[PDB]
Amino acid sequence: KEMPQPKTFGELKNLPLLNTDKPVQALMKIADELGEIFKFEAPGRVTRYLSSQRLIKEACDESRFDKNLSQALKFVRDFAGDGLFTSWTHEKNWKKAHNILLPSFSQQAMKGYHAMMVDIAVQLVQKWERLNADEHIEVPEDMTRLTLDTIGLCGFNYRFNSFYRDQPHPFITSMVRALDEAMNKLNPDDPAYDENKRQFQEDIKVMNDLVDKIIADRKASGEQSDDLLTHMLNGKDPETGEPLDDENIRYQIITFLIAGHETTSGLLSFALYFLVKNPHVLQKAAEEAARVLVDPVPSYKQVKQLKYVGMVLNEALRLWPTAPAFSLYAKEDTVLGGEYPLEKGDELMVLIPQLHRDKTIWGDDVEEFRPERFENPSAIPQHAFKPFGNGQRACIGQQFALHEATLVLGMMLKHFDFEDHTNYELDIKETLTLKPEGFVVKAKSKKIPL
Ligand code: HEM
């Protein structure tokens, strides 16, 4: 079959159809019109967007397709290096870091990070407890302070102290500005970008200098902490027998922050958005939080018992997966779905929000927020629900992100009632990630001490 494709406009190809800063949302609308697969061409480039479980399951066959570095990832690689997120599968440091780090990101490993996640979560709760009457909360902004600080503390035992500041720690300022410049890069040698380049280089140096110093401090003290840095200093890859070198360790630390901060904060923000818009679900979730979180701060075991909170989070990931697209290439010539010939090197994009709206899997009501879809997670067909990507190149942080989010949302629901005081209109900003831009609430404390 010929591959469906939107209208082309001479040499502009399909580009005039994507004149937006919200391309994923625009591509979803194109998928609504054209279906499970369409080609999209712009001057000098081509990809193919997939949106059905049936085709995405095939695309997820690692014998036929592997992770591609999109142009976004190639620009991020300028400061994330050969960390896990921005490496090709074949790179020696991908394989070594993957093997070394997997055990440190397992569900069992979460027991070791729990206390430090609670430390930052308590700081968030106390911030909100201390607001004066009529003050409000900037949701994504506070969730991002939380996730940055949690990844810093669990990643390398470093306190960014984001809840002490108006202006973030200089590392955060540089990382956020570097990521913003990478995304904005999507005539770059024009002199008017001279300042962009100088600033980018300056931000790289700030990031490398801090992380390289802590790595050095840690090797000097011999201190063993409950952080990922300790695991990386001590770990050996079973296959090569080699540890990660100090440069790659730095890139992994930078990577954890980049890959984890806004995905996780976006999830918490969308979950709270859906809860304030669905009062009955909010009540059920808050009832569970009150029933289960019976101690002054949560234990690891208690977080594991927040079943319905976990369902809420999965249903937020279903509707607005916060890293909404990933790229694949064809390893060899092949035919996709019995119908679409592909050449070696051809790119595919998995459009995750549209996958998560495949009516053939989810039924007719796909826009409804219904956590009960996830009552029995094992009943969901493989490759229908993919907010954390695919296979060996899936999110290594998944258990971390979900432990964090379940703990934090549980505490939020234990400690406060929330008000959508502005009747907030969902406005989804797209960068590397998705967030509900401008989402604000008021919280009324239940006055339960920590
Ligand atoms: C809800 C939160 C998160 C979501 C939705 C998410 C999603 C994803 C997705 C879709 C990928 C695959 C990207 C691709 O194929 O190009 C990925 C990869 C990755 N993520 Fe996450 N992420 C989240 C949180 C985290 C956190 C908290 C960390 C670190 C602590 C993290 C670290 C990574 C790393 C290192 C990779 C690359 C893995 C590899 O290729 O070996 N992520 N993530």
- Say yes or no: CB of residue 84 within 6 Å of ligand 1: yes
Q: Are 449 and 93 in contact (CB under 8 A)?
A: no
Evaluate: CB of 408 within 6 angstroms of ligand 1: no
Q: How was this structure obtained?
A: X-ray
Structure tokens, 12: 């502009």
- Closest residue by Cα to atom 37, ligand 1, is 85
CA of 227 to the centre of ligand 1 (A): 18
Angstrom distance (rounded) from CA 47 to CA 35? 15
From residue 254, how far is each of 22, 201, 263, 306 by CA, in Å?
A: 26, 15, 15, 31
Q: Which residues are catalytic?
A: 263, 388, 395
Q: Which of 24, 110, 154, 263 to mutate to test the pocket of ligand 1 (most atoms within 8 A of CB)?
A: 263
**Whether the Cβ atoms of residue 309 and residue 292 lie closer than 8 Å to each other:** no
Token reading at 202: 């300056």
Say if residues 134 and 274 touch (Cβ distance below 8 Å): no
Amino acid of residue 188: P
Spatial distance between the Cα atoms of 51 and 146, rounded to a whole number of angstroms: 33
List all residues 6 or more positions away from 39 whose beta carbon is below 8 Å from its beta carbon. Answer: 3, 4, 5, 46, 47, 48
**Residue 439: alpha-carbon gap to chain centroid:** 18
Query: 297 with 122: CB under 8 angstroms?
Result: yes
Residue 322 Cβ inside 6 Å of ligand 1? The answer reads yes
11 burial via Cβ count (<10 Å: 0-12, 13-18, 19+):
exposed
* DSSP letter string, 240-303: T-PPPPHHHHHHHHHHHHHHHHHHHHHHHHHHHHHHHH-HHHHHHHHHHHHHH--SSS--HHHH
- Report the alpha-carbon distance of residue 212 to residue 254 in Å, rounded: 11
Nearest to 295 by CA among 181, 449, 162, 189: 449
307 phi/psi in degrees, rounded to 5: -60, -50
The C-alpha atoms of residue 149 and residue 156 are separated, in whole angstroms, by 10
Give the residue carrying structure tokens 């620009």: 75
User: Of 219, 233, 211, 110, which is closest to residue 160 (Cα–Cα)?
Assistant: 211
* Residue for token pair 């095939």: 58
Using CA of residue 288, residue 290, residue 291, residue 293, what is the dihedral sign? Answer: positive
**Second-level CATH architecture of 1-450:** Orthogonal Bundle (1.10)
Pairwise CA distance, residues 7 & 11, whole Å = 12
Structure tokens at 131: 């607001």
Residues in the chain, how many?
Answer: 450
> Angle of helix 71-80 relative to helix 246-277, nearest 10 degrees?
130
Q: By alpha-carbon position, which residue is closest to atom 4 of ligand 1?
A: 263
Find out whether 308 is annotated in a ligand binding site.
Answer: no
Question: End-to-end distance of the chain based on CA atoms, in angstroms?
Answer: 62
Q: Which two tokens stand for residue 217?
A: 């401090």
DSSP 131-187: PPTT--EEHHHHHHHHHHHHHHHHHHS----GGG-SS--HHHHHHHHHHHHHHHT--
- Separation in Å, CA 443 to CA 272, 290, 308, 414, 449: 12, 16, 21, 12, 16
Among candidate residues 142, 208, 213, the one with its CA nearest the CA of residue 175: 208
The neighbour count for residue 343, using CB atoms within 10 Å, is 9
What is the CA(2)–ligand 1 centre distance, in A?
Answer: 34
60 annotated ligand-binding residue: no
Atom of ligand 1 nearest to the CA of 261: 27
Sequence positions preceding breaks in the chain, C–N over 2.5 Å: 186
Question: 200 alpha carbon to ligand 1 midpoint, in Å?
Answer: 24
Q: Which residues pair with 65 in a beta bridge?
A: 330
- Of the candidates 171, 169, 165, 155, the one whose C-alpha atom is nearest the C-alpha of residue 123 is 165
16 DSSP 8-state letter:
G
How, if at all, do strands 440-445 and 334-336 pair? unpaired
Q: How far apart are CA 197 and CA 206, in angstroms?
A: 14
Say whether 28 sits in a helix, a strand or coil: helix
- Cα separation, 120 vs 275, whole angstroms: 22
Question: From the CA of 128, how far away is ligand 1's center (Å)?
Answer: 29
Determine if ligand 1 sits within 6 Å of the CB of residue 396. yes
Q: Does 352 contact ligand 1 (Cβ within 6 A)?
A: no
Give the closest residue (by CA) to ligand 1 atom 21.
395
Q: Is the CB of 393 under 6 A from ligand 1?
A: yes
> Can you tell me the distance from the alpha carbon of 320 to that of 25, in angstroms, rounded to the nearest whole number?
10
Select from 434, 312, 328 the least CA-distant residue to 372: 312
Closest ligand 1 atom to residue 70 Cα is 16
**DSSP letter string, 388-411:** T--GGGS-TTHHHHHHHHHHHHHH
Spacing, Cα 398 to ligand 1 middle (Å): 7
**CB of 255 closer than 6 angstroms to any ligand 1 atom:** yes
DSSP secondary structure code for residue 233 in this structure: H
**Residue 92 CA, ligand 1 centroid: distance in Å:** 19
Q: How far is CA 200 from CA 43, 172, 206, 215, 256, in A?
A: 27, 14, 10, 23, 19
CA distance 288 to 43: 53
Residue with CA at minimum distance from ligand 1 atom 16: 326
**Does residue 386 line the site of ligand 1, with CB under 6 A?**
no
Resolution (A): 1.2
Q: Which two tokens stand for residue 219?
A: 């090797």
Q: Token digits for 366?
A: 């796909």
* Domain coordinates in residue numbering, the chain: 1-450
